[PDB]
Design a binder for this molecule. Structure first.
Ligand SMILES: Nc1ncnc2c1ncn2[C@@H]1O[C@H](COP(=O)(O)OP(=O)(O)OP(=O)(O)O)[C@@H](O)[C@H]1O
Ligand SMILES: Nc1ncnc2c1ncn2[C@@H]1O[C@H](COP(=O)(O)OP(=O)(O)OP(=O)(O)O)[C@@H](O)[C@H]1O
Ligand SMILES: Nc1ncnc2c1ncn2[C@@H]1O[C@H](COP(=O)(O)OP(=O)(O)OP(=O)(O)O)[C@@H](O)[C@H]1O
Ligand code: NA
Ligand code: NA
Lengths: 105, 99, 101
């Protein structure tokens, strides 16, 4: 198992491409994204409502925080969105763990 | 980063509004919800809620109200994960999550 | 609260049944599954399973069987998170997730 940070970004659906681009530039090895609904309290939604949730597994905490900081500064003063982070362990993932595999021992 | 509990409720889709109302009455600052499928032990369409709360007791209050009120008659599972919120105006206030 | 491992499998949609059968053969009490997109426009459609297991070994069994069978040929990632189950009739039994003795 290889420790990882699962960065979750839940935001407005119109930001899908803009956020993916950031994730792609970050050096993160990939992402998962899904359609969700949400209700919030920040009261910032540009114009239950339909959102998207990204999940990005990163090798380091700093990479997760650099993504988070770049998304939030660039979009979250103007669009609704929340970003949080969970601890995970990756058991299998060719890209994430490299040809060497995620170990186990 | 500000510590938080991520409460997850996976249950039958017809309970959507009822469960949202409980979440809204708990003091929680919001929720995310999605359509999912599932198999349990006696694929079918259901919903998953995710609710980030400031305290554990708020998460358990939501969980306890939902389960007592609906889980005798409807399928469902409720679990909780630890998270840290990095950005969230409502959840972390004007001062930000540097908490 | 009853401790649990949440096993997450994100992989190609065509493995849905093959993976459900593995989950069912593990002893796991059930699973949640959803449609997602992923990059590893160049987003692709895939599925995500979430399986709460009683023990770590059951989670790793499911993970190992899936990966060994399918991940040479199909895209996928498998990870695990810690969870505590507060309510779940099947997962926690008739005595509930807050039993004492
Ligand atoms: N405490 C929380 N728990 C879970 N999800 C949340 C929470 N707070 C916000 N969200 C998610 O983040 C999204 C954006 O909420 P936010 O408070 O940032 O802005 P908002 O304009 O109030 O959003 P919305 O228009 O949905 O209310 C929500 O729609 C929801 O899916
Ligand atoms: N061990 C588990 N891991 C992940 N999700 C689960 C698990 N057990 C149950 N679930 C989710 O909870 C839902 C409700 O299942 P539960 O066993 O409470 O009742 P059930 O009536 O047998 O459900 P179903 O109609 O799906 O068979 C399931 O569809 C599934 O999405
Ligand atoms: N670092 C990561 N964080 C979150 N999800 C990931 C990550 N890496 C991969 N995934 C998910 O796993 C799926 C499979 O990706 P993987 O890296 O196995 O292969 P790929 O062949 O590059 O996939 P794709 O066809 O999606 O480009 C991806 O579509 C994505 O949903
Ligand atoms: Na709002
Ligand atoms: Na790829």
């Amino acid at each position: 198992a290889k420790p990882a940070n699962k960065l979750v970004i839940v935001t407005e659906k119109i930001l899908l491409k803009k956020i993916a681009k950031i994730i792609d530039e970050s050096g993160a090895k990939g992402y998962t994204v899904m359609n969700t609904g949400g209700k919030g309290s920040r009261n910032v939604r540009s114009s239950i409502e339909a959102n998207i949730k990204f999940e990005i597994l990163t090798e380091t905490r700093e990479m997760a925080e650099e993504i988070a900081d770049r998304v939030a500064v660039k979009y979250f003063n103007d669009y609704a969105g929340i970003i949080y982070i969970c601890s995970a362990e990756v058991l299998y993932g060719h890209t994430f763990c490299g040809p060497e595999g995620c170990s186990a021992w």
